[model samples]
Target chain A: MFEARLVQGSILKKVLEALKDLINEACWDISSSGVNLQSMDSSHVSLVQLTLRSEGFDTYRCDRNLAMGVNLTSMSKILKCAGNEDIITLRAEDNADTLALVFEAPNQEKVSDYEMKLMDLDVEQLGIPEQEYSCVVKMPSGEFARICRDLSHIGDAVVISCAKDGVKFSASGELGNGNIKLSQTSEEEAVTIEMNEPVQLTFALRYLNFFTKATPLSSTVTLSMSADVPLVVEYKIADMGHLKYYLAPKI
Target chain B: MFEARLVQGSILKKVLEALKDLINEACWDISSSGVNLQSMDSSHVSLVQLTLRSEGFDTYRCDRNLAMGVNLTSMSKILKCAGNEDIITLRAEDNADTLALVFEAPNQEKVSDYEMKLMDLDVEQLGIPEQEYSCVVKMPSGEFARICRDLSHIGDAVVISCAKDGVKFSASGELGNGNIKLSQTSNKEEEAVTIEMNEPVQLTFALRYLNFFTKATPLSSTVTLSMSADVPLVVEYKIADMGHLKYYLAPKIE
Candidate 1:
């Protein structure tokens, strides 16, 4: 038997919404510690590693460890039905083929349940090796989401060049090229760059847009990149730990 | 016997748009008092009654009472061509079968005229009895539209329950169910939720018609919902001092 009730219900809902566009289905492993989902997107252009902590939830009970493959698209549809303020819960038996999602209204006046048919997804468990990036840029998540969307219309890829004092994102197409420059602010300091070296790399705007969908998870997004490696787009919220997407750069 | 002019020409344009969805074709009755339209939707699941007062416009005149059938879809198409700021006037030869719409640019530098062919259609009128409803709730039109739209995702119908303190709209479907509650808010009176409840009432109505009636949101800052047990739901949008658009949808017996 397994059941986990979220205290801050909107976090899980937002997480599902953030991942809905990129990944169609993925697997979540449940243990006494909590749940963690790790998989690559459908095109294999990007990878997502998601983790949820039992401590973060209000009530959690796990008798045995189990792995459940889920269709994220269907999961998100159920999440959207949950009132933003509703407390949500996840439940499944050890031998269950379907997952049960329960939502309680904020006022406790309404409660609804949905049984989502689980899937038998082919799993590839890859261990991500942590490394120090050459450049790490922290900026407003909303700004990053906007920059990627704005540049995507003009070109298929974007060039992200970082300096000690500022960062620039540029994309060009047959129409024209657009370059957005952001300088480190002093007053509110909305943007900041931690540079081991001034690095410039080009990445596909399509995958970058998918990564930025995690913007709702946090106000600030951290973009960590190394020479010719993958771009790490990460959002951290205390309730659900963090969601990180790794998209390799374009040649 | 039927000629009237309005100063804010866009009001007529907006009025047609408010009816464009529920009523594809409508019959307008023009009298000295003003113009009033009353008709059941083609499907007959709902009814729409609209009125415009001559005193609210810059100038007006009505020599007689004439009921004319109009294809509102085409009427709205012609209305869209007029500048929103233009002053519009309505004129028809008492014996003619066409309605002439005159648009005068705010600067009076440009004038446009469109003649819409009136249809020879029958009109059946239903008299709505004047009776006090169990509950009359007024709220921001924009918010009301948003709630109805959002709830439609979860279900085809919504149960609206009004209490002394607030109101709750709940919907359920095969996927899931949810409820949204709005407390009587203390804000700018026009923007606040105020309920006049003679008796607490809970009724169900199809969200399809509710969403359709919301097109009138643009005509009024606020919308009034009048409901009573087993009675038709009255969704009313006031056009300020000008007139009003009222929609009556029969409650679903669920």
Candidate 2:
């Protein structure tokens, strides 16, 4: 038996909305600790990791660890019916073939329940190692998303350069070259960066845009990078855990 | 030469929105008095007449009487650029092939000007003789629109019965039956119907056209319905104390 209840449905709704575009099918690992999902895109260019702690739920119970494989697109369509303030409950029997989602309105005026068939996905989870990064830039999620969106229209790749002064994002295409520089300043509340040393790297603008899809999940995002390592973009879900995305740097 | 300027762009936007779906191309009669347009739908089952007074605009000018023909679909697309509070100016030269519309932002931050090609439609205007109707019902436009929309799903036609007691709209289909009734009440805020005669008059009209005509409700709060036996049903929407839109729909004979 497995059941989890969230008083605010928007958290789950937003997380899934950000995930559906990257991963088509994923296995959600549900246990006493929380619900965890780790999957890479079909092309293997990026990796997505999600963690929601059991403590975040109003009531969570699990007799045994279960891996529920579901189609992300169908799950997202179901989540669209959930109101922001609605209470959402997920339930499934032991070895059940389908998952049940229940949405209850606060006023008891609306109650919608859906049953979605689960899939059997043969996915191998990759091990992510901890590494010290050369630079980590923290900025407002909205600003990052806007930069990625605006820059994507101008070029295929973006060059990210970090120095003691600030971090610069520049892109050049047939139209022209555009650069956005964000620095750690006392007056600006938009960005704050921490770096052990200066580092510079280039990555595909398409992947960065996909990674920034998690912008709506949090107010701010942290970017951790090294010389030749994957770029780690993380969004912390406050009291719960964090959603981290890893994109390989382009040559 | 002809020119007119509206201080509130949304009013013209709403008027054009209400007319575009009913007629495709129409020749507008422009004179010193105002602008008048009367045309029937392609099926000839419905007719729409619009009258905008010179007093409605901030500035109005007309050198001579001219017929300006235009495709409403293209005109509607151009009007979409105008902000609600923006100033809209319409201008055209005598026998010009195009009409120019200028939108000026209230804060002078943005200005959009568009020139749309005019069409020379070979259509004749029909004169509708005035008749004394057996029933004339005046009620809230929103209430009438909602009633027509709700009954439209049930049938293709709606039966409107007006008497000294009240006015009732009824429809029946495979889905079910729906009825909405409004009567004379002392409550000033709610729906109040005024009938011209004590006898009852019933008329069945195509629900689809009535629903389409109700799109004008956004411009006005009240609707006046005038119906006569075996004649066309007139739906009148009074606009901003200066203009009026009248739609005449032929009764669906049983």
Candidate 3:
């Protein structure tokens, strides 16, 4: 038997929303420690890794380690029924074919239950290696979303250049080119960047936009970049853990 | 030249929303007094009459009496571009085939202009003989809309029975039966039905059509149901101090 309860349903809601668009099907590894899902987009252009600690759940029980395969789209549809403030509980029997989701209001007067059939997704997990990054930019997630959205209108690729002065994101297309530069300062509390050396990398705007879907999960997002390496975008879930997305750099 | 300006665009938005579902196309009679539109549904089972007085507009001008024909569906799509607090100005030249809508934001930064091609709808005004209703029930429009929506789930026809005591709306179907009865009492502030009736009257109407009429609830706080025996029921919604919307639905004979 396996069951987990989260006091705030939005955490699960946001995690699914951020991953469903990129990965169609994935397997979540559930254990006593919590739940972890790591999957790459079908084209292998981007990878998403999610970690939710067991301490984050009000109630968590696991008889054994279980790998549950799910169609992200179907799971997303079921999660849509949850209210933001609802307490969400997930239940599944050992090797069960279906997963049950129960949402309860604060007063417990309203409750909705949904059962979704599990899928058999054949996915191989890719081992993500730890890397030393040249530049790490931490800024408000809302600003990142806005910048990506505005620049996406210009081109498919955004060239992120990190320098001693600041970090600049520039793009060019048929509509002409535009660039936004953000700098760190003592007076402004919006952005801060740490760099060992200057690094410039060009990545697909589409992948960047998909990464910004996690904006609602946190107030700030940290971007770790290295030349010729995939960019790691991280969003901390406050008291919980973090969700990270790694997009392969466009050559 | 003709132009009418509304400081609050939401008023115009709700008015169009209330009219669009019932009438597809109509000819609006614009004058110095206000804009008047009257049209019957294609099935001839329902009729909608709308009035917007000149005083309701912040600036109103009519060089001449112009009948502007418009397809309501297209007009509604254009109106969606307007912000709630934006100042909406409707303009047209004398005998023009196009109507220009100018939306100006409060900060004077964003301005959007749309010109919609007008359709030539052949419509005639029906002479409705006014008669004293046997029963007039005034209550909160929101409450009436909620009742219609809930009863529509039960059946296609709703029986509205009014007595000196209160009013009852009920529906029965293969699924089940549902009934909501509201009485006249000043004790309940949220919902109170005031009925003026010489005698009790029962009328059955197609719930789908009545549900369509409830779209006017967004424009008014109160709805007055005027019913007479063997006649079309009038659902009237007063648009604050501006004007009113009257929907006439033929009773379904059992």
Candidate 4:
């Protein structure tokens, strides 16, 4: 008998939520260290890898190495009904054939269970290194989502630059583009604590959208960046390091 | 001090949910009889009147006559965050300056308040007959939405006819002077109901879209149609006679 427990819905929701624009199929790897998902869109110009550390889970149990492939969109539908504050517990039969989701809604006496059959997916292998990110900025999920959404209307790519104030997202295309510059306007809401060195970069708006989609799932997310390199987005799904995603930008 | 109560978030959600699609601004007329909402869309094509009788509320207190125009989209946003089973109380300050929605979440430490400033909307007067509809069909809300969404693509106007089997929504438009016809088909999940001897007529697509927009807040809504010469199509939000709306369709003769 094998089982894994997570207070949040399957890490699959965050994985799929981040990937709003891309091909339906990709490589998904789940192992003892944790789960890692990586895939490139049809054009192969960009790639996205999502990592969920085992330490993030309240209870992490894995006897032997196992890799399970799943469809993120299909799993997202089931997770949408769950109460955000509900203690969500997930269980699977020994064979990993049937999966169950139990949602303990605070107000209701009865718990709601949403179950679905797991389909075997063939995952491709992409070597993703835990590289040392040059620049990282922590900001509220709401602000990040708004900046990305508002800037995307003018163009399909965004230039992220770090300044004395904070991180600035600027975009331009056929139509005139606009910039949403966020900084430490106030002590409580200001951006502080630069963990890494300063860096600036430009990435496709399509990929940036995928990262901001998780705003509703979590209160905050951190953006790790480098000049003309991949951008890392980390989401706290559980206690600590529950769910983390890193996406590579176009050249 | 003015206060009102709704059964559950689901009921109010379901009612305004559907009405939001048909009409943007509805005058919530609170009087001694009860709370009544009566208004036609801007085009003055469809008329909808929904009343939440005082009996349905756990607490109801509205002494003076008040007309508050509520934007369903904003209301839905607040309602969507509410606990499904939470008992909701709405309080409006004197002169109904501000409307405060207070409700206790399941395990929350305190009540959440969503307040929105109300606006005054000049509602048009529409005369809708209370006559019983010629053909009444009850089906699932998804099915009706699918039909309306599908027929909308064909042309700006669709001919809704009720026959013995079920209702038929047909739309025809010209493509380089060639006509294209689209109709609804019944399958396993949704069934179309039609009544015999019901006069067949056509309505503009614009009004239908407005009617559909009002009810978009609800996941599911049932539409009851009345067909006759120069007839007004009545699409109920959820159930017939439970806060209903009637859209008048003017025939466009070729």
Off by over 4 Å in 1: A187-189, B1-254
* Tens digit per residue, CA lDDT, model 4, A1-251: 33445665545455566664554555445566765667776576556656667777666666655555445566667777776666666565566665576777657586888776666765666666667777678777775765666555456887787865567666665433345555543332335436467776777776667666666656777787776556777666645443445455656
- The runs of at least 3 residues in candidate 4 whose Cα sits more than 4 Å from the true structure, single-residue gaps closed, are A1-251, B19-22, B107-110, B174-221, B239-242
Which candidate, 2 or 3, has the higher lDDT?
3
Q: What are the TM-scores, per candidate, against the unseen true structure?
A: 0.51, 0.56, 0.57, 0.49
Q: Per model, state how many residue pairs clash.
A: 0, 0, 0, 16
* lDDT leader: 3
Task: Give the docking tier of candidate 4.
Answer: incorrect
Q: Give lDDT: candidate 4, residue A31.
A: 61
RMSD of each: 16.4, 10.2, 9.9, 14.5
Candidate maximizing DockQ: 3
lDDT of 1 by residue, A1-251 (tens): 89999866889888988888798989999988988989888788888988787787789999988888888999998888888889989999767799999999988989999999988888778887898999999888876886777666456998899988788887666433445567775522278889999898999988888787777778898899888888898888755578889888875
Would you list the clashing residue pairs of candidate 2?
Answer: none
Give the alpha carbon lDDT tens digit for every residue of A1-251 in model 3.
88999998999999898888888899989899999999988687898989999999999999988888899999999999999999999999876698899999988899999988888887677878989899998887876786777666556898898976678877766423455566664422367778999998999988888888888899899999997788999999989889999987875
How far off is residue A235 in model 2, in Å?
18
* Native A-B contact fraction in model 4: 0.00
Alpha carbon lDDT of each predicted model: 0.83, 0.84, 0.85, 0.60
Give the lDDT of residue A142 in candidate 3: 79
Cα lDDT tens digits, model 2, B42-91, are 67779999998999889999888878888786677566656678799888
Q: Give me candidate 2's TM-score against the actual structure.
A: 0.56
Off by over 4 Å in 2: A1-251, B175-178
DockQ of each: 0.01, 0.04, 0.04, 0.03
